[PDB]
Design a protein around this ligand. Structure first.
Ligand SMILES: C[S@@+](CC[C@H](N)C(=O)[O-])C[C@H]1O[C@@H](n2cnc3c(N)ncnc32)[C@H](O)[C@@H]1O
Ligand SMILES: C[S@@+](CC[C@H](N)C(=O)[O-])C[C@H]1O[C@@H](n2cnc3c(N)ncnc32)[C@H](O)[C@@H]1O
Lengths: 149, 156
């Protein structure tokens, strides 16, 4: 059971159904096949990853090209969703889930601010991600600092 | 039903995952045209109501905490690919509330915490918008977990 929690942690017994549905709009390809190999957070000088946007949404890439700084939203598909208190250092220092950027969340939405190296059709070659190879894409937006000074 | 120059997808498939509404955001704006395009730090005070189930997860958030607030734009059509928010633009190239997954964010500082309620300025959503996540904003958060090999990996 990946169900066990660390000392100091707290899991919710909540078992309701979802209120809305998320569509996976692409797939993110990265160097990392194991969670323990992933960066905690991406770095802008990091390895090139490839965001493959699915064919339905290709026209929505209009305006994104080489160099565009993006806020990339992805679904952390391996994460449990029930933790309320977490101890990211496994030392009994428990923090509310909303006070940390842990991938374990009620809605496991991850973001990275990441600049497109190169675009080739549906593929965005991009630096600055931190997710497992094959992580689902859920949204792309222009980063605030570049889009709105 | 769209403007000349826009493009919609005629895609109709089931969702791949489910989103849980963890709260509700209470704001001054009852109509879409009343909402600011983006939130401002000196805008009207709003109330983020976190539902009972997730109250314990607010531990560590208090007056003065800088948050990244994620909400579900529940009134948005999800099919637009080119939009005229002026030449039409790709949906992914703008911060429009009309998106395949209509997730909005605002970066805003908690003015006051009271139990499951956060009183906060800098939002832009319709009164009654569902909350989907809260994170400490990057500008004021330092990751707690220890470094991993990926943290040291620089690209060629
Ligand atoms: C700390 S989270 C930060 C996510 C994002 N940078 C953010 O701030 O929202 C990054 C971690 O999520 C984990 N992870 C990466 N891909 C994942 C996936 N697809 N499902 C669940 N966990 C994942 C890895 O342990 C990685 O180190
Ligand atoms: C331009 S979007 C930006 C959202 C967020 N600040 C971001 O950058 O991700 C803000 C607009 O979304 C619209 N809106 C607000 N709440 C909504 C809701 N619940 N459903 C659909 N549209 C909404 C309003 O027109 C508002 O001006």
């Amino acid at each position: 059971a990946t169900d066990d929690i660390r000392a100091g942690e707290l899991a919710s017994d909540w078992s309701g159904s979802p209120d809305a549905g998320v569509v996976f709009i692409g797939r993110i390809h990265t160097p990392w096949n194991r969670l323990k190999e992933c960066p905690r957070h991406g770095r802008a000088d990091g390895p090139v990853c490839r965001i493959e946007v699915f064919e339905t949404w290709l026209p929505a890439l209009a305006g994104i090209d080489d160099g565009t700084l993006l806020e990339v939203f992805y679904w952390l598909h391996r994460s449990r969703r029930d933790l309320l208190l977490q101890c990211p250092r496994n030392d009994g220092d428990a923090r509310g889930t909303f006070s940390i950027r842990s991938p374990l969340r009620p809605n496991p939405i991850g973001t990275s601010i990441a600049r497109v190296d190169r675009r080739d059709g549906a593929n965005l070659f991009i630096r600055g991600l931190d997710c497992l190879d094959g992580t689902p894409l859920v949204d792309l937006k222009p980063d605030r600092a570049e889009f709105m000074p």
